[PDB]
C-alpha cells in the first residue's frame, strides 16, 4: 500500500513556491482590513 | 436589566449552585489509575475489593479506580489525562523474571515523565505466591538483605526503589506493597497510602515544607 | 495622679518609642509586601490563604495604630490631640492584637484538621467557610473590645495630660473584672487550643522522612515565637493590674511596671515577624 | 520513489518565503489583554469550541462537565454532565442545536440542546472507533468527521449511527483535524510527524507532508483553504501549501523548548496564534516567521485555543481550570 | 522525513565481534535521547541500550552490561552499539530508536509494536 500511495501522490501538479507565497501574501493583504486583532 | 436577561442570570445562578454542589463531592473522592502488564493480574485486585471503572469506599471515603485497556500500545499521548489522580497503581508480575526488565523500564518511564513527575505511585508486586514456589539480573549474587524468597522479593523491590529514588525527590513518592493473589486488604493499603499522599500535599501547602 | 507611689518611668521614653517605631516601620513594610503578593501575584486562595490574609490585615492595622503611640510616648506621656483619639488608638491597638491572636488560632486549628484528618476533612467543604470564620472572628473581637472605648479616657494629672491605657480612677474594679474576663476568653482558650493543635500535629508527624521532621521544626519555631511573644506580656499585664488593684510597696509596683513595659515590645514584635514566619 | 518526490519538490522551490516577503511592512507588537475570565469549571480545561454565532462557546474539563458559556455575559447557558470524565474534544454544531464530545471512552456522544420542554440529553452515541477520540467536527446536523488514536479517521451518519467512510492510511495516533472552508476536504496531523490531506467524498489521501520532526499536536486550515499550519512537539510551527506540496515557513525560535498544544489563525490569516506547554501563548507573523505578541495570562498549561468566526476575539482555555477571552 | 538507516548486520560465530551504526537524518541529532531495540525469533520487542542527548548517562539491560558498550557522534549524526562478547542467544534484528520528543527522555513509546521514529533494522544472525 505504501508504494502504491507514493506512486499515486508522486504524479501531482505542483506549482512554484513563489506563486504560492504570492497568493498567500495577496490574500493576507486583501483581507487585512477586516481582522480586528 | 431586561426580563430575559434577568432570567438568564437566574438560570446561570442555579447552574453555578449545582456546580458548587458537584464540587463538594468531586474533591471528596479520589481517582486512581491502574497500570501494569497483561500478566500482572491487576483485575484480580479489582474484583477482590469491588475502560473499566471500579468504585469502592473505605472509611466512608470514596475511591474510583480506572483500568483503561481499550487503547493501543502507544500511550505517550493519552496518559496525560491521568495528571491530577491521587495516585498511580502499578502492578508487577514479580514471578515472571522474563518481563521484569520491561516492567522496570515502564516504571522508569512513568517516574521521569514531565506530566507524571508530581504524582505518587503505589507499587503492588502481585504474583508473590508463584514467586515463593519458583525460587537475567546479575546483581542477585552480591545483593544483601537490608529464606531465599525474602532475598528475591526484596531484591525486586530494591530495583524498583533504586529507580524510584534515582530521580524523584520532594514531589512524588513510591509505595511498594507485597500483594498476594487472594489478598482481601488492598483497599486498606490504597486508603492509607492516599492518606499519606494527601498529608504530604497538605504539608506542602501549609508552608511547613 | 492621686497615687501615693510615683513610678520612675525614665526608661520608657527611651525604650518604648524607638521599639514601637522600628516595629511599626518593618510591620508596615512586610505586611504591605505580603498583601501585594496576595492581591496581585497569587490565585491559590485556600482556607490557609484566607486566614493568612486576615492576619496580615490585622498586623497592618496594628502597625498603623503604632505611630500615635510612639508619638505619645516620645512626648513625655503627653496627649494634646483629643479625648476620642486616645480611645480610638487603644481600641484599635487591642483589637488588632486579639485579632492576630485569634487568626493564628484559626490557622492552627485548620492545620491540625488537615494533618490529623487528611482524607476525612475533605468530605466537608471548609475552604469557603474560612471567610465566614474570619468574619465571625472580626465581629467577635470588635464586640469584645467595644468596652475599651468606654473605659479608656483622657485625664490630666500635672502639667501634662495622659492617654490612659487602663481606665480612669475610681473605676478600676470594673475594668479589672472586665480585663480578667477578656484575658480569659481571648487568651486562655486561644493559646491552649494553639498549643494542643500544634502538639498533636507534631506528635503524629513524629510517628513514622526529611519533610516530616522539617515540618515539626517549623511547628516548634512558630509555637515558640507565639509563646515568647504573648505569654509573658499577658502574665505581666495581669500581675500588674492585680497588684495595682491591691495595695503593696512602691518598689514592687515599680518592678512590675518595669516588667510590663519591657514585655510590650515583644507583643509588638509578634506582629513584626508574623509575616516572615507565615509566608517567607 | 521518495527521492523522486523530494527532487520534484526541490525543482519547484525557487523563492523562499523569507526572501519573497523580506520587503513587507512588519506588523506592530501585538498587545492583547484579557476581557473575560470564565471561572466555572472544577478542573483543567481539555478542549473548547466556538459557536458560529460568535457569542456562545462550549468547553470540556477533567471533571466530566460540558459547560456552554455566554462569552458576552460570562453566564453559563448549560452544564452537561458526561458519563466519562476523560474527554479531549469539543464540537459545536454550525446550526447550534447540537454539541458533541469524546475521549478515552472512544465514543462521540452527541447532545441535543434544543429539546422540547426537557433538559439536554444524549441524542446519539457513535461507537465504531477503536482508539481514543482525539478530535471531532460537525459537517452539518447529520454528519460529523471524527479522528481517533487507532491511526484512523471516519465520517459518520448521525441518524443511523455508523461510519460512512474511513480514512485508514496513517501512522501513529491522529491528534487533530481541520475542516476546509468548502467542507470538501480536511487535513489531519498525527503522531508519525506527518500530515495528510483527505477527500471527504472520495475517501482517499491526496497529499502527505513530512516536514516536522515529532508528534503533531494541532492543525489549522488557512482561511482561503490553500494552506495549513501544524504545531508539534519539536517546539516548532510550520506552514504547508497544498499547491506547492512543500513546507513554506518555520516558526521556530531559540529558547523555545516546549511543544505546541494549540494552533489557530486569525480571520485574515496574518496572525498565527499558537498555544504552548510553557504556560503561555505566542502570536506569530505567518508570512515573516517573527514573534508579534504573547498572551501570558494562564497559570498551568494552554491546552486549547480558538479564534472566533468573525475574528473579534480569541479564547484560550488552560489547565488552571480557567478560560480567557482576549482582544 | 525522519529516516534512520542502520548497517553492520552479518553472521558472526559465538566468538568474534561486530559493530552496528545507525545514520540519522531529517532531524537535529543532539536534542534527542536514543536507544537500541532488540527483536528475536518468536518473541516481542526488547530494549538493549540508552544514551542521553549530551552522552553523559548510559543505561543497559541486565544481560548486556560490560559487553555492548555504546557510542554516539552528534557531529556525524551516528549512534553505535559495539558488540564484543557475543553469544548464540543474541540472534536478533536491531533497530536504532529515538525518544518521541526533544529535551524529553520519555522514550515512552520506543519499544512499541508500531513506532514511527524507528529504523528498518539489520538482521544480526549467529
Ligand atoms: N497605682 C499607680 N501608681 C503610680 N503610678 C500609676 C499608678 N497607676 C497608674 N500610674 C501611672 O499612670 C500612667 C497611666 O496609667 P495607666 O494604668 O492607665 O497606663 P499603663 O497601663 O500603666 O501604662 P501606660 O501609661 O504606658 O499606658 C502610667 O504612666 C503610670 O505611671
Q: Which residues of E23-54 are buried (b: 16+ CB within 10 A; e: fewer)?
A: ebeebebebbbbbbbbbeeeeebbbbbbbebe
Instruction: Closest CB to D191: pick one of E27, E28, E116.
Output: E116
CA quadruple C189, C192, C195, C196: dihedral, nearest 10: -100
CA distances from D151 to B70, D105, D144 (A): 14, 16, 17
- Give the method of determination: cryo-EM
**Residues in CB range of C83: below 8 A, 6 or more apart:** C153, C154
Cβ-defined contacts of D63-67 (< 8 Å, 24+): D63/B22, D63/B26, D65/B19, D65/B22, D65/D41, D66/D90, D66/D99, D66/D101, D66/D111, D67/D40, D67/D41
Residue B168 falls inside a structural domain:
yes
Nearest-5° angle of CA C84, CA C86, CA C90? Answer: 120
Please, which chains are in contact with E (at least 3 CB pairs closer than 8 A)? B, D
DSSP code of residue D27: P
Residue C4 falls inside a structural domain:
no
Q: How far apart are CA C199 and CA D65, in angstroms?
A: 42
Residue C3 falls inside a structural domain:
no
Structural domain span for residue B45 = 29-205
Q: How far apart are CA C9 and CA B71, in angstroms?
A: 83
Q: Which of B99, B95, B90 is nearest to B67 (CA)?
A: B90
Q: List alpha helices for C122-249, DSSP H.
A: 129-151, 172-183, 189-205, 211-245
> What's the gap between Cα B159 and its chain centre?
18
- Which residue has 475610681 as its cell numbers? C170
Q: How far apart are CA D185 and CA D204, in angstroms?
A: 10
Q: How far apart are CA D59 and CA D78, in angstroms?
A: 11
Cβ(D176)–Cβ(D134) below 8 Å = yes
Residue B23 falls inside a structural domain:
no
Q: How far apart are CA B148 and CA B126, in angstroms?
A: 18
- Which residue has 484575658 as its cell numbers? C183
Radius of gyration of chain B from its Cα atoms, rounded to whole angstroms: 21
Between the two ends of chain A, the Cα-to-Cα distance in Å is 45
H or E stretch including E20?
strand E18-25
Instruction: Closest CB to E102: pick one of D172, D193, D234.
Output: D234
Residue C98 falls inside a structural domain:
yes
Q: How far apart are CA E38 and CA B152, in angstroms?
A: 27
Does residue B76 sit at the E interface (CB-CB below 8 Å)?
A: yes
Instruction: Closest CB to A20: pick one of D223, D248, D311.
Output: D248
Q: How far apart are CA E42 and CA B52, in angstroms?
A: 31
Strand partners, E94: E38, E122
What cell numbers appear for D2 in the block?
Answer: 521518495
What crossing angle do the helices spanning C211-245 and C189-205 adopt, rounded to 10°?
Answer: 160
Please count the residues of chain E: 126
DSSP code of residue E125: -
Does residue C17 sit at the B interface (CB-CB below 8 Å)?
A: no
Distance from CA of E57 to the nearest CA of B (A): 12
Q: Which of B120, B67, B126, B116 is nearest to B91 (CA)?
A: B126
**Residue E49: HSE in the Cβ half-sphere, 13 Å Cα cutoff:** 26
Q: How far apart are CA D26 and CA C172, in angstroms?
A: 81
For ligand 1, the distance from its centroid to the CA atom of residue C106, given in whole angstroms, is 34
For the structural domain made of D1-326, what CATH number should be given?
A: 2.130.10.10
Q: Which of D109, D58, D57 is nearest to D82 (CA)?
A: D109
Instruction: Please report residues of E whose CB lies closer than 8 A to that of B114.
Output: 104, 106
Instruction: Closest CB to B76: pick one of E47, E62, E108.
Output: E108
For ligand 1, the distance from its centroid to the CA atom of residue C162, given in whole angstroms, is 9
Q: D185-190 and D174-179: which strand pairing?
A: antiparallel
Q: How far apart are CA C213 and CA C205, in angstroms?
A: 7
Q: How far apart are CA B112 and CA E33, in angstroms?
A: 13
- Which residue has 499521548 as its cell numbers? B77
Q: What is the CATH number of the domain that holds B185?
A: 3.40.50.300
Supply the DSSP string of B48-88, one letter for each residue.
H---EEEEEEETTEEEEEEE--SS-S--TTGGGG-SS-SEE
Q: Which domains does chain E have, with CATH numbers?
A: 1-126 (2.60.40.10)
Structural domain total, chain C: 1
**Residue E53: HSE in the Cβ half-sphere, 13 Å Cα cutoff:** 14
E27: left (phi over 0), alpha (psi -120 to 50) or beta: beta
Q: How far apart are CA A9 and CA D194, in angstroms?
A: 15
HEC letters along A1-37 = CHHHHHHHHHCCCCCCHHHHHHHHHHHHHHCHHHCCC
Q: Which of D86, E108, E35, D148 is nearest to B75 (CA)?
A: E108
D51: left (phi over 0), alpha (psi -120 to 50) or beta: beta
Q: How far apart are CA D145 and CA D106, in angstroms?
A: 14
Distance from CA of E120 to the nearest CA of B (A): 19
Q: How far apart are CA D231 and CA D216, in angstroms?
A: 6
H or E stretch including C53?
helix C47-74
3-state secondary structure of C71: helix
Q: Which of D243, D140, D134, D233 is nearest to D192 (CA)?
A: D233
What crossing angle do the helices spanning C12-40 and C250-279 adopt, rounded to 10°?
Answer: 20
H or E stretch including C98?
helix C85-116
For the structural domain made of A1-37, what CATH number should be given?
A: 4.10.260.10
Q: Which residues of B39-51 are buried (b: 16+ CB within 10 A; e: fewer)?
A: bbbbbbbbebbee
Strand partners, C135: none
Q: How many CB atoms lie within 10 A of CB D253?
A: 13
Q: How far apart are CA D42 and CA D197, in angstroms?
A: 37
Q: How far apart are CA B63 and CA C114, in angstroms?
A: 19
Between the two ends of chain B, the Cα-to-Cα distance in Å is 50
By CB neighbour count within 10 A (0-12 exposed, 13-18 middle, 19+ buried), where does B90 fall?
Answer: buried
Cβ(D164)–Cβ(D156) below 8 Å = yes
Q: D65-70 and D133-138: which strand pairing?
A: unpaired
Q: How far apart are CA B63 and CA B41, in angstroms?
A: 20
Chain E CA closest to residue D195: E1
Q: How far apart are CA D76 and CA C135, in angstroms?
A: 30
Please, which chains are in contact with A (at least 3 CB pairs closer than 8 A)? D
Cβ(D199)–Cβ(D184) below 8 Å = yes
- Which residue has 497529499 as its cell numbers? D207
C164 lines ligand 1 (CB under 6 A): yes
C78 lines ligand 1 (CB under 6 A): no
By CB neighbour count within 10 A (0-12 exposed, 13-18 middle, 19+ buried), where does D110 fall?
Answer: buried
Mutate to test the interface with C, among B194, B207, B209 (most CBs of C within 10 A): B207
By CB neighbour count within 10 A (0-12 exposed, 13-18 middle, 19+ buried), where does D248 fall?
Answer: buried
Cβ(C24)–Cβ(C269) below 8 Å = no
DSSP code of residue D300: S
CA distances from C133 to B112, C19, C127, C197 (A): 42, 33, 10, 17
Strand partners, E18: E83
C11 lines ligand 1 (CB under 6 A): no
Q: How far apart are CA B142 and CA D99, in angstroms?
A: 62
Distance from CA of D259 to the nearest CA of A (A): 24
What crossing angle do the helices spanning B186-205 and C211-245 adopt, rounded to 10°?
Answer: 60
C7 lines ligand 1 (CB under 6 A): yes
Supply the DSSP string of C105-133, one letter for each residue.
HHHHHHHHHHHH-TTGGGTS--STHHHHH
Domain ranges of chain D: 1-326
What cell numbers appear for C119 in the block?
Answer: 482524607
Structural domain span for residue C151 = 12-279
H or E stretch including D221?
strand D216-221
Q: How many CB pairs under 8 A join A and D?
A: 116
- Cβ distance of B59 and C120 shorter than 8 Å: yes
φ and ψ of D279, to 5 deg? 75, -10
Cβ(D185)–Cβ(D195) below 8 Å = no
What cell numbers appear for C278 in the block?
Answer: 507565615
Sign of the Cα pseudo-torsion (C72, C78, C82, C85, in order): positive
Residue B110 falls inside a structural domain:
yes
Q: List alpha helices for chain E, DSSP H.
A: none
What crossing angle do the helices spanning A2-10 and D2-11 adopt, rounded to 10°?
Answer: 20
Q: How far apart are CA D53 and CA D58, in angstroms?
A: 12
Q: How far apart are CA C16 and CA E117, in angstroms?
A: 75
Mutate to test the interface with E, among B105, B158, B167 (most CBs of E within 10 A): B105
Distance from CA of D35 to the nearest CA of E (A): 35
Structural domain total, chain B: 1
Amino acid at each position: 500500500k505504501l508504494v502504491e500511495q507514493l506512486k499515486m501522490e508522486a504524479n501531482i501538479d505542483r506549482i512554484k513556491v513563489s506563486k504560492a507565497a504570492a497568493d498567500l501574501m495577496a490574500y493576507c493583504e486583501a483581507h487585512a482590513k477586516e481582522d480586528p486583532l | 436589566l431586561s426580563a430575559e436577561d434577568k432570567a438568564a442570570v437566574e438560570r446561570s445562578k442555579m447552574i453555578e449552585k449545582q456546580l458548587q454542589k458537584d464540587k463538594q463531592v468531586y474533591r471528596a473522592t479520589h481517582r486512581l489509575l491502574l497500570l501494569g502488564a497483561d500478566n500482572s493480574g491487576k483485575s484480580t485486585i479489582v474484583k477482590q475489593m469491588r475502560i473499566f471503572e471500579t468504585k469502592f469506599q473505605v472509611d466512608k471515603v470514596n475511591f474510583h479506580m480506572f483500568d483503561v485497556g481499550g487503547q493501543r500500545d502507544e500511550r505517550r499521548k493519552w496518559i496525560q489525562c491521568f495528571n491530577d489522580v491521587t495516585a498511580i497503581i502499578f502492578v508487577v508480575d514479580s514471578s515472571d523474571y522474563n518481563r521484569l526488565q520491561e516492567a522496570l523500564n515502564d516504571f522508569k518511564s512513568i517516574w521521569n515523565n514531565r506530566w507524571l513527575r508530581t504524582i505518587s505511585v503505589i507499587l503492588f508486586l502481585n504474583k508473590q505466591d508463584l514467586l515463593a514456589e519458583k525460587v537475567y539480573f546479575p546483581e542477585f549474587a552480591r545483593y544483601t538483605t537490608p529464606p531465599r524468597v525474602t532475598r528475591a522479593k526484596y531484591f525486586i523491590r530494591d530495583e524498583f526503589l533504586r529507580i524510584s529514588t534515582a530521580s524523584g525527590d520532594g514531589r512524588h513518592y513510591c509505595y511498594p506493597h507485597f500483594t498476594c493473589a487472594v489478598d482481601t486488604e488492598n483497599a486498606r493499603r490504597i486508603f492509607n497510602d492516599c492518606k499519606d499522599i494527601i498529608l504530604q500535599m497538605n504539608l506542602r501547602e501549609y508552608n511547613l515544607v | 495622679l492621686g497615687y501615693r507611689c510615683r513610678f520612675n518611668e525614665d526608661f520608657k521614653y527611651v525604650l518604648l518609642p524607638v521599639s514601637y517605631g522600628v516595629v511599626c516601620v518593618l510591620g508596615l513594610c512586610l505586611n504591605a509586601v505580603a498583601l501585594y503578593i496576595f492581591l496581585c501575584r497569587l490565585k491559590t486562595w485556600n482556607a490557609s490563604t484566607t486566614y493568612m490574609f486576615h492576619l496580615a490585615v490585622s498586623d497592618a492595622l496594628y502597625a498603623a495604630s503604632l505611630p500615635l503611640l510612639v508619638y505619645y510616648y516620645a512626648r513625655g506621656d503627653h496627649w494634646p490631640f483629643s479625648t476620642v483619639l486616645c480611645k480610638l488608638v487603644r481600641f484599635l491597638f487591642y483589637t488588632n492584637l486579639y485579632c492576630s491572636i485569634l487568626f493564628l488560632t484559626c490557622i492552627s486549628v485548620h492545620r491540625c484538621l488537615g494533618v490529623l484528618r487528611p482524607l476525612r476533612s475533605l468530605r466537608w467543604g471548609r475552604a469557603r467557610y474560612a471567610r465566614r470564620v474570619a468574619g465571625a472572628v472580626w465581629v467577635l473581637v470588635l464586640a469584645c473590645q467595644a468596652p475599651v472605648l468606654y473605659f479608656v479616657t483622657t485625664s490630666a494629672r500635672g502639667g501634662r495630660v495622659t492617654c490612659h491605657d487602663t481606665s480612669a480612677p475610681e473605676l478600676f474594679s470594673r475594668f479589672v473584672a472586665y480585663s480578667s474576663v477578656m484575658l480569659g476568653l481571648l487568651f486562655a482558650v486561644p493559646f491552649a487550643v494553639i498549643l494542643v493543635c500544634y502538639v498533636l500535629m507534631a506528635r503524629r508527624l513524629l510517628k513514622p522522612p526529611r519533610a516530616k521532621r522539617k515540618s515539626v521544626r517549623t511547628i516548634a519555631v512558630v509555637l515558640a515565637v507565639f509563646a515568647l511573644c504573648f505569654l509573658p506580656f499577658h502574665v505581666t499585664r495581669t500581675l500588674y493590674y492585680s497588684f495595682r488593684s491591691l495595695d503593696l510597696s512602691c518598689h514592687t509596683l515599680n518592678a512590675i511596671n518595669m516588667a510590663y513595659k519591657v514585655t510590650r515590645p515583644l507583643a509588638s514584635a509578634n506582629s513584626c515577624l508574623n509575616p516572615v514566619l507565615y509566608f517567607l | 520513489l521518495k527521492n523522486q518526490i523530494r527532487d520534484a519538490r526541490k525543482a519547484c522551490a525557487d523563492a523562499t518565503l523569507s526572501q519573497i516577503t523580506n520587503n513587507i511592512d512588519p506588523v506592530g507588537r501585538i498587545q492583547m489583554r484579557t476581557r473575560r475570565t470564565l471561572r466555572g469549571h472544577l478542573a483543567k480545561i481539555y478542549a473548547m469550541h466556538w459557536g458560529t454565532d460568535s457569542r456562545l462557546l462550549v468547553s470540556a474539563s477533567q471533571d466530566g462537565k460540558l459547560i456552554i458559556w455566554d462569552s458576552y455575559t460570562t453566564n453559563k447557558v448549560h452544564a452537561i454532565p458526561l458519563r466519562s470524565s476523560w474527554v479531549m474534544t469539543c464540537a459545536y454544531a454550525p446550526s447550534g442545536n447540537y454539541v458533541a464530545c469524546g475521549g478515552l471512552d472512544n465514543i462521540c456522544s452527541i447532545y441535543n440542546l434544543k429539546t422540547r420542554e426537557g433538559n439536554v440529553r444524549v441524542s446519539r452515541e457513535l461507537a465504531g472507533h477503536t482508539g481514543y477520540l482525539s478530535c471531532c467536527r460537525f459537517l452539518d446536523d447529520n454528519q460529523i468527521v471524527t479522528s481517533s488514536g487507532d491511526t484512523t479517521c471516519a465520517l459518520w451518519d448521525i441518524e443511523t449511527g455508523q461510519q460512512t467512510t474511513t480514512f485508514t492510511g496513517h501512522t501513529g495516533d491522529v491528534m487533530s483535524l481541520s475542516l476546509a472552508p468548502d467542507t470538501r476536504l480536511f487535513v489531519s496531523g498525527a503522531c508519525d510527524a506527518s500530515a495528510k490531506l483527505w477527500d471527504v467524498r472520495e475517501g482517499m489521501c491526496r497529499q502527505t507532508f513530512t516536514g516536522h520532526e515529532s508528534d503533531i499536536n494541532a492543525i489549522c486550515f488557512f482561511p482561503n483553504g490553500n494552506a495549513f499550519a501544524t504545531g508539534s512537539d519539536d517546539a516548532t510551527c510550520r506552514l504547508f501549501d497544498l499547491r506547492a506540496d512543500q513546507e513554506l515557513m518555520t516558526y521556530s525560535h531559540d529558547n523555545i523548548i516546549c511543544g505546541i498544544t494549540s494552533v489557530s489563525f486569525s480571520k485574515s490569516g496574518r496572525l498565527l496564534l499558537a498555544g504552548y506547554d510553557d504556560f503561555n501563548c505566542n502570536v506569530w507573523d505567518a508570512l515573516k516567521a517573527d514573534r508579534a505578541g504573547v498572551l501570558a495570562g494562564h497559570d498551568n498549561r494552554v491546552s486549547c485555543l480558538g479564534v472566533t468566526d468573525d475574528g473579534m476575539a480569541v479564547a484560550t482555555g488552560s489547565w488552571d481550570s480557567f478560560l480567557k477571552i482576549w482582544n | 522525513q525522519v529516516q534512520l538507516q542502520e548497517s553492520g548486520g552479518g553472521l558472526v560465530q559465538p566468538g568474534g565481534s561486530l559493530r552496528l551504526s545507525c545514520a540519522a537524518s531529517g532531524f537535529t541529532f543532539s536534542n534527542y535521547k536514543m536507544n537500541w531495540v532488540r527483536q528475536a525469533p518468536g518473541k516481542g520487542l526488547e530494549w538493549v541500550s540508552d544514551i542521553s542527548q549530551s552522552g553523559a548517562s548510559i543505561s543497559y539491560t541486565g544481560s548486556v552490561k560490560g559487553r555492548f558498550t555504546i557510542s554516539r557522534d552528534n557531529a556525524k549524526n551516528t549512534l553505535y552499539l559495539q558488540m564484543n562478547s557475543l553469544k548464540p542467544e543474541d540472534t536478533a534484528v536491531y533497530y536504532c530508536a529515538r525518544c518521541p520528543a526533544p529535551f524529553t527522555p520519555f522514550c515512552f513509546d520506543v519499544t512499541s509494536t508500531t513506532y514511527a521514529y524507528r529504523g528498518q533494522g539489520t538482521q544480526v544472525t549467529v
